[PDB]
Amino acid sequence: AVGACVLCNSQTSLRCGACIRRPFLCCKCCYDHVISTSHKLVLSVNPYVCNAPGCDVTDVTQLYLGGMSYYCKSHKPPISFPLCANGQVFGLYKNTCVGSDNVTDFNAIATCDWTNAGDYILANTCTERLKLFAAETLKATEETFKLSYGIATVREVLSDRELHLSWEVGKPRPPLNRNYVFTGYQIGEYTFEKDAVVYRGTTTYKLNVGDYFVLTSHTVMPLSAPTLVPQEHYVRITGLYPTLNISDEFSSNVANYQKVGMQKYSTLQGPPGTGKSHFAIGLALYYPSARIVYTACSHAAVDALCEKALKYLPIDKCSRIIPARARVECFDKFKVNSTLEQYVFCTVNALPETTADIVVFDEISMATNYDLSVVNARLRAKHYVYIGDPAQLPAPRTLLTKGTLEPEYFNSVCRLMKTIGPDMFLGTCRRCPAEIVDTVSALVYDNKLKAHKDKSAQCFKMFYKGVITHDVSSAINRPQIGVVREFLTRNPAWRKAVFISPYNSQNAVASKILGLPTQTVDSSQGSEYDYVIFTQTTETAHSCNVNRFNVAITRAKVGILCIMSDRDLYDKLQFTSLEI
Ligand SMILES: Nc1ncnc2c1ncn2[C@@H]1O[C@H](COP(=O)(O)OP(=O)(O)OP(=O)(O)O)[C@@H](O)[C@H]1O
Ligand SMILES: Nc1ncnc2c1ncn2[C@@H]1O[C@H](COP(=O)(O)OP(=O)(O)OP(=O)(O)O)[C@@H](O)[C@H]1O
Ligand SMILES: [Zn+2]
Ligand SMILES: [Zn+2]
Ligand SMILES: [Zn+2]
After folding, report:
1. Is the shortest distance between the CB of 234 and ligand 1 below 6 Å?
2. Of 444, 402, 419, 465, which Cα lies nearest the Cα of 546?
3. CATH number of the 434-577 domain
4. Which residues touch 275 (CB under 8 Å, ≥6 apart)?
5. Is the dihedral of CA 56, 57, 59, 60 positive or negative?
6. Please, what's the b/e burial string for 60-88 (b: 16 or more CB within 10 A of its CB; e: otherwise)?
7. Are 348 and 321 in contact, with CB atoms under 8 Å apart?
8. Residue 504: how many CA atoms within 13 Å on its side-chain side?
9. Residue 241 Cβ < 6 Å to ligand 1
10. Where does the record place its LRR repeats?
């Protein structure tokens, strides 16, 4: 019942009983909270509630200290004092309290519902202590809301991959995509796609009628470590030992590797195809005796670093850390769960508590402030390297419905990269034809991204609005897909292209009609393909977001066809226009 104030670190015996996280607040900060919000329940060693029989007064502003007990105005003894007085709520340490001038920001964080983009803006521009409080509060709210979705029970099993579901009446249904993972009853985790529903299970299990699926929730632990440790700048390389014979394949990053060793943490912005994994793995080659923990949010990102390390690092010194409660198939070519190896590859959620000379945290645009705090709490390192690109996509915020979240507010690292700039920048795209490079360089990179490749003359655009149908909220554009079918009859080298759309439902229609592999933009992040076919599908904030569009067109190595709905983005594509 005694702790440190979330706003000013002062010792206190008070917590707000109305905030979902029950934060400690000192006598001064607690006053500013209760006098300006609906939160009136104050918790101490004992709760601040009227102590007379039958009384239900719990509003601290209507409560008084009589002796050592609390009473309302109708029950207080003649010798009593108001609990709220002199800008202070009575509690222990009433004279050491410092107070804070940021309580207004606390009050907004503590009372918002996380549906507006301004809640996330405030969560990223406040003090460091408030950032943790907002991250914890948001995550709890997100987790509790998962209880709002209905239960799904199998009515019949059509095949090994299709079934008919029964949805609980009185509650909304979750969208059926690869981001919504249900737990079956425990017969493993399942995902559903679109009355027949396509089901994918962790193991091939004989599903029965009556088995049910529940959205996988999770308890939310408190945070203690900052999103970023305080910065330090050193006179020379600290804790690391450079080689003298780094191969020329990695020598262009030597100066950047030196800078990594001169500061506590450093940020690297790497636009698509500019060599992020190459940078990350070369860091180990330049500091060959360093213990390096490579981490990121998704298994796919960690597995991509593993594939890179397999080519260049000693395999006997690598371990992939896979949580015992297995879920998906991870990289399998390293020793598994040998936490003490020199090179450890692990998703954030599964990080062991250990130390390292260097922590590399990849795909930083996808991280949240909760992730960044978890990484600092579990990994004590001499150097932290944050790799990513704030012009790519963030983690979906399931509660946000009003307003768009700009890159500067994705997390603390993206905020630094957007405000003061990244410590390092990989400036040459080696993956994409120059038509793409030139488009995105002007679109999101202030013309700072250079093309190494020539124009391919296989980059095409077509302006075709089509017809927009919907499966709930996921959009479909059958005319746009018909145009693609026509294109394929006349361009047989594209038979091997990957279809990309901003919508799962569109992708599903394309799979059946066109026969091509399909991917959503968001799931295509970190991937590359020779030929890509993109159908914008609709003109929405989702389909026109510049970060998503950047990602979409930068997956292609040789050629891309973009069937567009928005005039602005169509015009900016530096491609050859196709007729019809
Ligand atoms: N790979 C290495 N090559 C050469 N000398 C090394 C190497 N690793 C450690 N040493 C030496 O051994 C000492 C003790 O190692 P230790 O790991 O405890 O220190 P350190 O954390 O790297 O030190 P500092 O941060 O002051 O550089 C180092 O300070 C350094 O002088
Ligand atoms: N600094 C560099 N110097 C020389 N060649 C490089 C450099 N960075 C990357 N390359 C070349 O580009 C190839 C691909 O790099 P990488 O594995 O990082 O993937 P990418 O798709 O280009 O980039 P990213 O991971 O940023 O999307 C490397 O295998 C290497 O041949
Ligand atoms: Zn409160
Ligand atoms: Zn305080
Ligand atoms: Zn009373």
Report:
1. no
2. 444
3. 3.40.50.300
4. 426, 430
5. negative
6. bebbbbbeeebbbeebbeeebebbbeeeb
7. no
8. 15
9. yes
10. 216-236
After which residues does the chain break, using C–N > 2.5 Å?
Answer: 185, 194
Distance of CA 56 to the CA centre of its chain: 43
CA of 414 to the centre of ligand 2 (A): 22
d(CA 537, CA 518): 14
Those residues with Cβ within 8 angstroms of residue 248's Cβ, 6 or more apart along the chain or in another chain: none
- Ligand 1 near 338 CB (within 6 A): no
Residue with CA nearest ligand 2 atom 31 = 249
Q: How far apart are CA 472 and CA 504, in angstroms?
A: 11
Whole-angstrom CA distances from 540 to 101, 159, 200, 395, 546 are 40, 36, 30, 19, 12
CA 422 to mean position of chain CA atoms: 19
Cβ neighbour number for residue 230 with a 10 Å cutoff: 8
The size of the chain, in residues, is: 580
Dist. CA 387–CA 365, nearest whole Å: 9
Using left for φ > 0, alpha for ψ between -120 and 50, and beta otherwise, residue 169 falls in beta
How far apart are the C-alpha atoms of 552 and 560, rounded to whole Å? 10
From the CB of residue 396, how many other CB atoms can be counted at a distance below 10 Å?
11
Q: Which two tokens stand for residue 443?
A: 């679109």
Q: Is 90 left (phi over 0), alpha (psi -120 to 50) or beta?
A: beta
> From start to end of 297-353, where are the E strands?
318-321, 335-336, 343-347
Task: Tell me whether strands 188-193 and 197-201 are parallel, antiparallel or unpaired.
Answer: antiparallel
Consecutive H or E run containing 108? helix 103-111
| CA 137 to centroid of ligand 3, rounded, Å | 11
Task: Please choose from 310, 430, 436, 437 the residue to mutate so as to test ligand 2's pocket, defined by most ligand atoms within 8 A of CB.
Answer: 430
**Rounded alpha-carbon distances, angstroms, from residue 367 to 120, 347, 387, 488:** 14, 11, 11, 38
Q: Contact 29/99 with Cβ under 8 angstroms?
A: yes
Q: How many CB atoms lie within 10 A of CB 448?
A: 12
Q: Is 413 exposed, middle or buried (0-12, 13-18, 19+ CB in 10 A)?
A: buried
Looking at ligand 2, which residue's alpha carbon is closest to its atom 22? 273
- Three-state SS string over 256-290 comes to HHHHHHHECEEEEECCCCCCHHHHHHHHHHHCCCC
For 73-172, strand residue ranges (E) read: 81-82, 84-85, 88-89, 152-157, 162-167
Alpha-carbon gap, residue 26 to 5, rounded angstroms: 5
